[model samples]
Target: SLRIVFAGTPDFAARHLAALLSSEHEIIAVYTQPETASPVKTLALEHNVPVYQPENFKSDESKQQLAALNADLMVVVAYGLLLPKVVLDTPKLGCINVHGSILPRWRGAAPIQRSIWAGDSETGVTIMQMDVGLDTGDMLKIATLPIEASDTSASMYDKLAELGPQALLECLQDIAQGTAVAVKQDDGLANYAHKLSKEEARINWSDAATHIERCIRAFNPWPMSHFEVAENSIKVWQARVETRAVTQTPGTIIQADKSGIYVATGQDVLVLESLQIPGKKALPVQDILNARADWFSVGSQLS
Candidate 1:
């Protein structure tokens, strides 16, 4: 077995770390990021994997600490920061990354979300040889997964997490044996999965039925498409596009009926399947609508 050092930061990275821990290889060191605001409970003290959390990526101290590992190779997955040459060159085999998207496509942060939002038919992980450019890594091994019509960020996350460990091993096997070669990315056909902003998590009910539905899927779990009624934030937990026409204007609240909390968007009726009242657990929209009627109105529009 070879000396290995893995770098990653988020839950996705942590999942890979957990997978690696079970492997036969030796893990000399680990690295991750500092805690950030929690999506569910903003003030909650989140726990991350036990690993390094250097304050600055390019710090000489960080580089010196990593160099001491004398690792044969470094495995990275969604580490959330660009690596400088110093750290990348310390390991004998350099650093390899398990990027969320297939190489030359959806190359950057937010690949899974961007793939769903852009209506791509498929997306998957690519184990690549890392460089300084933005996800401009050379492909080592690739695996494909379809982007299901109902795939939400939440659902997609579960699927991708399962895919990571197996794919990483595949790349390692080939790289360890020197049977595989890295291939350069095609920048001309590349699509950037731009880092998601807190603002993009929004529902523009006035767009199209398909657009509204997809927006919901793409932003699931984190920024669940920030929706607002007056000044109150209305997070769309679950919703579907209405096939039939409605008299309500986009953003208008048609009714909080017995079936669901039906609201209008750019071009379709969004029947909210689940939601939450501020500072409460997420509940079926029907349950909340039954308890409170002040949230719905015939002329209400999402802001």
Candidate 2:
């Protein structure tokens, strides 16, 4: 069994950590980002593993502390900090990352969301050998998962969270046995998956129904797609694209009934199935209309 130094923070990372804890390897130390509550820290603590939360690895102290671990290898998943050469070279086998997307594609902070937003047919995890560049690592193993039309960011998050650990464990075994193959990424095919921003979460009614419907799914459960009516915010939690044409302008409410709230869009229609108002929990369109049917009236505009 290898001596492992685990580095990760977010829930995705924590899930991978949980699997590592049950493995045959010796986890000497764990790393997470400071000033944030992480399940990684909690899980490590439960196993009596020491956890280190440093602001950055540029500092000699941070680098030295990790170097002292004497780990055979380090396993990283969603650890946000950039590692310096000193830190990267500390372990015998260096570092391996469980990235959310297949390498050379969606290589950045928000791969899962970017893949869905970009209308990619498939996205999966890539176990890569860490490098100095941003997600520019040699792929150790690739595991593919389909992106269904009904998948939201929240749904894909759950799927990848399960898929990531399985691939990481397989790669770790190959690394331990000295049989891990590294595949170079094609730079020409790469696309940067920039982190999501608040401004980008706003719903643009003028966009095509397909695009708007995707946005609603991609941004679900965080910075959800939203629009305003009478200066009040209304979040779109679930919506479907409809091809039915209407004479109403984009952003206008074409119909409002128990079935659904139909809104006009650039090229087609958007049938809002689930929504939420400010200070209200997410509710079905019919339920929201039950008590406040007048809130959304036909011919009203949402912008």
- The top-ranked prediction according to lDDT is 2
Deviating ranges (above 4 Å) for candidate 2: none
Q: Each model's number of backbone clashes?
A: 7, 0
The sequence of per-residue lDDT tens digits that candidate 1 reaches over residues 1-303 is: 768887776677777766776777777767666666212111111323235667666777888888887889999876666788777788999999888887798887789898888888998889888888888878888888999888998888888888977899877878778888888888898878887766877666677867777778898877777677747786777777777686767777776776777777666677888776678887887678677667675566656
Off by over 4 Å in 1: 33-53, 57-65, 246-248, 298-303
In model 2, the worst 10-residue window by lDDT is 33-42
Model 1 residue 154 CA deviation in Å:
2.0
Q: What would the TM-scores of all predictions be?
A: 0.84, 0.95
RMSD (Cα, Å) for all candidates, in order, is: 4.7, 1.5
Question: Once all C-alphas are superposed, what RMSD does model 2 give against the true structure?
Answer: 1.5
